[PDB]
C-alpha cells in the first residue's frame, strides 16, 4: 500500500514523503546534515508543487549528480534514472542510447523530466503517491 499526499495532510506524512521520494531517487538513504533542497521541500510543505515536481528536483539535485554521474559510468547513471523514477532497467541500448542524446542535446534536466513525465510513471504514480522501486515498500498509508 504506497505514500499519497492530500490537501489537509500532517507534518509527518510530508516529511514521510521527503524521506520516501530522496531514498528511492538515491538508492543508499540520500544525503541530509546540508543546504540541498531547503527551497523544494518547503514548496512541498506549503502545497505549491506536486509530488511529481519534488521528485522532479530531487532527481535534479547535484548532490544527486556529482555522486552518481561523477563516481559512476554515464550508461550505469540512466541505467539507475530508470530504477529511482520509474523501477526498471533499461536493459536496450536503444533505449540507454535515446536517454544519452537527450542528456547532451537538451542537458541534464531534460533527462531527469523524460522519466518524471513520462506516461508509465503518471497514471500509476499519479500527482499525489510517491514512486517506489518495483518490489520495495515499508511505509503502507491507508489512502
Given at each position: ?20 521520494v530522496?531514498?528511492?531517487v ?25 509530488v511529481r515536481?519534488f521528485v522532479r528536483?530531487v532527481a ?25 523514477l ?30 518524471i ?14 514512486p ?12
Amino acid at each position: 500500500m504506497p505514500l499519497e499526499w492530500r490537501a489537509g495532510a500532517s507534518s509527518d506524512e510530508i516529511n514521510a514523503i521527503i524521506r520516501a521520494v530522496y531514498r528511492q531517487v538515491l538508492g543508499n538513504d540520500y544525503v541530509m546534515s546540508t543546504e540541498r533542497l531547503t527551497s523544494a521541500e518547503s514548496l512541498l510543505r506549503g502545497g505549491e508543487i506536486s509530488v511529481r515536481d519534488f521528485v522532479r528536483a530531487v532527481a535534479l539535485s547535484e548532490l544527486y549528480r556529482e555522486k552518481f554521474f561523477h563516481n559512476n559510468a554515464h550508461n550505469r547513471f540512466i541505467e539507475l534514472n530508470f530504477k529511482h523514477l520509474l523501477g526498471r532497467a533499461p536493459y536496450d541500448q536503444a533505449e540507454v542510447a535515446a536517454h544519452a542524446a537527450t542528456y547532451h542535446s537538451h542537458g541534464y534536466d531534460a533527462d531527469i523530466n523524460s522519466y518524471i513525465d513520462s506516461a508509465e510513471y503518471t497514471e500509476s504514480f499519479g500527482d499525489n503517491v510517491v514512486p517506489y522501486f518495483r518490489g520495495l515498500e515499508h511505509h503502507h498509508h491507508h489512502h
